[PDB]
Design a protein around this ligand. Structure first.
Ligand SMILES: *[C@@H]1O[C@H](CO)[C@@H](O[C@@H]2O[C@H](CO)[C@@H](O[C@@H]3O[C@H](CO)[C@@H](O)[C@H](O[C@@H]4O[C@H](CO)[C@@H](O)[C@H](O)[C@@H]4O)[C@@H]3O)[C@H](O)[C@H]2NC(C)=O)[C@H](O)[C@H]1NC(C)=O
Ligand SMILES: OC[C@H]1O[C@@](CO)(OC[C@@]2(O[C@H]3O[C@H](CO)[C@@H](O)[C@H](O)[C@H]3O)O[C@H](CO)[C@@H](O)[C@@H]2O)[C@@H](O)[C@@H]1O
Ligand SMILES: *[C@@H]1O[C@H](CO)[C@@H](O[C@H]2O[C@H](CO)[C@@H](O)[C@H](O)[C@H]2NC(C)=O)[C@H](O)[C@H]1NC(C)=O
Length: 536
């Protein structure tokens, strides 16, 4: 079993290092994907260029040669993350952070040189680069990742650039009318104290009471804005109201981002540098995210590659407008082969049921539980509790009233190694229920020097009138868990040892003391994605 950790349907370069997804966009019918890439190793390098790939369905990709790589003094040292904006006149403009001769972080411009090439292979840079340089009180290593631009109703472009002032992270706002001459706006679009540099900021609108996407330049009352930023190792976000005129963003929760258990995240596991883009062809917003390796660097060099991209997911605001919902883009269903189905099956306490006839290491699993005896739910007020802490304290082996009940993905025939994605149900002294979702990567592998931290998050649903549901995209070294239709997502990287010889298995289990009935569960074996390489 050669290369037992490569994904079968997730995006990743033929080899080497890949990180931050770059300038995602849908242009002239072709889905363009770009990514931070090191052409020389399975490790970050001094020379990072923009990898390129195209697709007609976000599932099968054609690898192309790099698009943006050092060719100016404005980016002589490296080409880092950025975003693609399609200006009126239908011309994709790429704004990105370059590392110039004097190792400063500057904002550069670039656009397709051959606009009649469906794959937009060759890219040309503006002579005036860098179009923006670190403002007054900003360090030269704390100003990067320009976002996709949005055109104000006053016909003026706007973009946010990550950074910070006195370690206080922020989204610096800039304006322009020609997309070349940018003027910095006195205050940032959003801030947070002592969070360190803000990375890959993303700012976009979301239609209320709708599951569709909106182009970046939509404003209204039936629209809310999302200020996303990456800091302290995760991607945080906050839904609020944006006034392009007054030029201020007011978070709904009335709270500035913290990076505390009070703020929201897209995913709660391995998920970084996330960036969305609008798919006008299907009127939806697609979210791309880098999923870092969790094994050793030695391991990376060994297997010859590092970095994966979460499967593209659709994004929209929840019906209650308090949080965002994500779901794998529908095209993924095209990879489904045969199906195994379970219905009205009861998981008695201490059980472990094996799903048969599935490509256990490359599958799409959906399960929905019907709870029995909520009354017996353990009493725990989760007001200030940290779910990741809790999932790490109580793994799959920690039996409870209701829970742990869920799945055992990428597991050994003998369960020596297993990744448990499960739920727990609690109740406070007031009889109110809380649902916890876990990814117990603790026993995921017996190998050493592998990060086996477990991830966790509470799921916002009333188990007293909703079946707790879970969907897992299992693809060798990555498992993406979607709890309750997209309200709680957890991406995990697992490197079990058995994969090197024996095959993987899939189990449903209940290690609680209460019964849980599988109202229904459906699993499909996922066929490989097509990745043709057109380079040289
Ligand atoms: C869209 O993008 C570009 C236009 O803006 C264009 O890219 C160029 O394509 C040409 C042809 O493929 C490249 O020319 C090369 O020239 C070297 C010179 O040594 C050769 O390796 C080879 O040309 C050969 O050499 C002789 C003279 O050309 C001749 O004896 C041979 O028969 C042969 O022509 C290459 O073709 C050029 O470097 C490219 N520049 C870049 C990097 O942009 C795209 O083709 C164009 N594609 C479309 C229409 O979408
Ligand atoms: O690839 C560039 C892209 O990645 C981001 C994070 O999403 O950070 C870039 C950054 O850190 C990287 O490089 C260091 C080694 O210099 C490595 O340890 C780290 O894990 C990497 O993420 O690179 C510059 C320095 O060159 C730092 O300011 C930054 O932390 C993102 O900001 C950027 O667009
Ligand atoms: C279900 O819960 C039991 C209770 O502990 C688990 O039992 C295991 O506990 C340890 C694993 O963390 C090991 O000592 C053994 O695997 C086993 N030992 C005990 C206490 O009986 C059990 O593994 C759990 N089921 C699974 C595999 O998730």
């Amino acid at each position: 079993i050669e290369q037992p950790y490569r994904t079968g349907y997730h995006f990743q370069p033929p080899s080497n290092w890949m990180n931050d997804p770059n300038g995602p966009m849908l242009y002239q019918g072709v889905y363009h994907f770009f990514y931070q890439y090191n052409p020389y190793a399975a490790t970050f390098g001094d020379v990072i260029i923009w990898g390129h790939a195209v697709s007609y369905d976000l599932v099968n990709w054609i690898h192309l040669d790099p698009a943006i790589y050092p060719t100016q003094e404005a980016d002589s040292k490296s080409c880092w993350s950025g975003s693609a904006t399609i200006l009126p006149g239908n011309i994709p403009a790429m704004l990105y952070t370059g590392s110039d001769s004097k190792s400063r972080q500057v904002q550069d411009l670039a656009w397709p040189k051959n606009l009649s090439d469906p794959f937009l292979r060759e890219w040309v840079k503006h002579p005036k680069n860098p179009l923006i340089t670190p403002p007054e009180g900003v360090k030269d290593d704390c100003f990067r990742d320009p976002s996709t631009a949005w055109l104000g109703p006053d016909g003026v472009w706007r973009i946010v650039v990550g950074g910070d002032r006195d370690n206080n992270g922020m989204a610096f706002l800039y304006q322009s009318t020609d997309f070349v001459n940018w003027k910095r706006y006195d205050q940032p679009l959003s801030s947070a104290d002592a969070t360190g540099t803000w990375q890959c900021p993303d700012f976009y609108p979301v239609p209320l009471n709708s599951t569709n996407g909106l182009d970046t330049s939509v404003y209204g009352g039936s629209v809310r804005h999302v200020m996303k930023a990456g800091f302290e190792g995760h991607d945080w976000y906050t839904i609020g109201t944006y006034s392009p005129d007054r030029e201020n963003f007011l978070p709904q929760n009335g709270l500035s981002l913290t990076g505390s258990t009070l703020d929201l995240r897209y995913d709660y596991g391995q998920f970084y540098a996330s960036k969305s883009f609008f798919d006008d062809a299907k009127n939806r917003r697609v979210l791309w995210a880098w999923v870092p390796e969790t094994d050793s660097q030695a391991d990376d060099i060994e297997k010859g590659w590092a970095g994966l991209q979460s499967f593209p997911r659709a994004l929209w605001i929840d019906r209650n407008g308090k949080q965002l919902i994500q779901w794998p883009v529908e095209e993924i269903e095209e990879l489904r082969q045969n199906q195994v189905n379970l219905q009205n099956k009861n998981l008695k306490p201490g059980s472990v049921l094996e799903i048969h006839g599935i490509a256990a290491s490359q599958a799409d699993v959906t399960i929905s539980f019907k709870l029995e005896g909520l009354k017996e739910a353990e009493v725990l007020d989760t007001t200030l509790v940290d779910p990741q802490a809790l999932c790490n304290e109580r793994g799959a082996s920690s039996r409870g009233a209701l829970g742990p009940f869920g799945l055992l993905a990428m597991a050994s025939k003998d369960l020596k190694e297993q990744s448990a994605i499960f739920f727990r149900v609690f109740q406070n002294q007031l009889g109110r229920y809380s649902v916890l979702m876990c990814s117990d990567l603790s026993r995921s592998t017996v190998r050493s020097n592998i990060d086996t931290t477990s991830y966790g998050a509470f799921v916002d649903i009333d188990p007293r009138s909703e079946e707790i549901s879970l969907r897992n995209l299992i693809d060798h070294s990555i498992i993406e868990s979607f709890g309750a239709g997209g309200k709680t997502c957890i991406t995990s990287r697992i490197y079990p040892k058995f994969v090197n010889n024996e095959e993987a298995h899939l189990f449903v289990f209940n290690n609680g003391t209460q019964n849980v009935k599988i109202s229904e569960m459906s699993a499909w074996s996922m066929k490989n994605a097509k990745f043709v390489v057109d380079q040289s």
